[PDB]
Design a protein around this ligand. Structure first.
Ligand SMILES: [Ca+2]
Ligand SMILES: [Ca+2]
Ligand SMILES: [K+]
Length: 135
RNA sequence: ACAU
DNA sequence: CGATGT
């Protein structure tokens, strides 16, 4: 019902889907960019949404922060909860990098603990998530 | 249908 | 218009 302003917000941006993928995390309150991943040559929107959440978990754990993470992605929130990214993207030579990152993110989830609430950003009521790359 |  | 997902 109410935005939790003391939080981290994440989003993906891409050129094509599948296509070049990047992601970033921002302070929900100020918009300050806290991390940004170098573009990955080929991935999907949902792989990027997933990697952004997991990177957020790692970022907050390293800093002993109990802030929640917002994502607008129903898919990525579920994949994190399941510790399994059920992407349809072909695993081939071209997609090796994104798949390595996804595999490594799952591996981290399977070897670490966290209490970070992962919250759905309600775009229809609140506008675009603060980490949005725009049009 | 809903979320991107 | 297309694609990624539950
Ligand atoms: Ca998003
Ligand atoms: Ca966006
Ligand atoms: K659809």
């Amino acid at each position: 019902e109410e935005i939790i302003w003391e939080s981290l917000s994440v989003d993906v941006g891409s050129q094509g889907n599948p296509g070049i993928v990047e992601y970033k995390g921002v302070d929900t309150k100020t918009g300050e960019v806290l991390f940004e991943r170098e573009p990955i040559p080929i991935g999907t929107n949902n792989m990027g949404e997933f990697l952004a959440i997991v990177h957020g978990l790692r970022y907050l754990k390293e800093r002993n922060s109990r802030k929640p993470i917002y994502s607008d992605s129903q898919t990525a929130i579920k994949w994190v909860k399941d510790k399994k990214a059920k992407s349809t993207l072909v695993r081939n030579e071209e997609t090796a990098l994104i798949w390595k990152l996804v595999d490594e993110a799952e591996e981290w989830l399977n070897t670490h603990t966290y209490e970070t609430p992962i919250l759905k950003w309600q775009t229809d009521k609140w506008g675009e998530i603060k980490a949005d790359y725009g049009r």
